[PDB]
Ligand binder design. Structure first.
Ligand SMILES: Cc1cncc(-c2cnc(N[C@@H]3CCNC[C@H]3OCC3CCS(=O)(=O)CC3)c3[nH]c(=O)c(C)cc23)c1
Length: 136
């Protein structure tokens, strides 16, 4: 009915918005290491250290599978990408500092894009849609 139709429109443009944001992050060359899942040959112990891996391609997949009801849930997976890089790469060799700084840069960039371009009242409507669906 009308309620369900208005709900789907809201989420449709949320997905269009998040899909545009995720594309702007993957094409940024600084974040290329986060745009695809890791190759285990490069990091054979990665799945023993990182219990919940995440990347930008997987984020796109979850956008299309309708897994995100809010922009905050989208940012939780961006934050997961960053905290995983901080957990797997310790503050030691010079290469470690590079990827750790790129991870925090990726996290700050994504939060700043959402904060500048997402209407707060559109966002609150998404938050209300999610809470209604979780408890119904
Ligand atoms: C081309 C490629 C494909 N798949 C995985 C790697 C890789 C390889 N090594 C890692 N950690 C090591 C652990 C020991 N200290 C050096 C770190 O690599 C630093 C290097 C900096 C330049 S980079 O292009 O960002 C790849 C990481 C990684 N640490 C990671 O958190 C990730 C996501 C990847 C990674 C590279």
């Amino acid at each position: 009915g009308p309620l369900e139709d208005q709900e789907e429109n809201t989420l449709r443009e949320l997905r269009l918005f998040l899909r545009d944001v995720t594309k702007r992050l993957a094409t940024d060359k600084r974040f290329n290491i986060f745009s695809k899942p890791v190759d285990i040959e490069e990091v054979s112990d990665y799945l023993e250290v990182i219990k919940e891996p995440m990347d930008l391609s997987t984020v796109i997949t979850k956008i299309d599978k309708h897994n995100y009801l809010t922009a905050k849930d989208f940012l939780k997976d961006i934050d997961l990408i960053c905290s995983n890089a901080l957990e797997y790469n310790p503050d030691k060799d010079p290469g470690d500092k590079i990827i750790r700084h790129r991870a925090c840069t990726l996290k700050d960039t994504a939060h700043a894009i959402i904060a500048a371009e997402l209407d707060p009242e559109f966002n609150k409507l998404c938050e209300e849609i999610k809470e209604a669906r979780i408890k119904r």
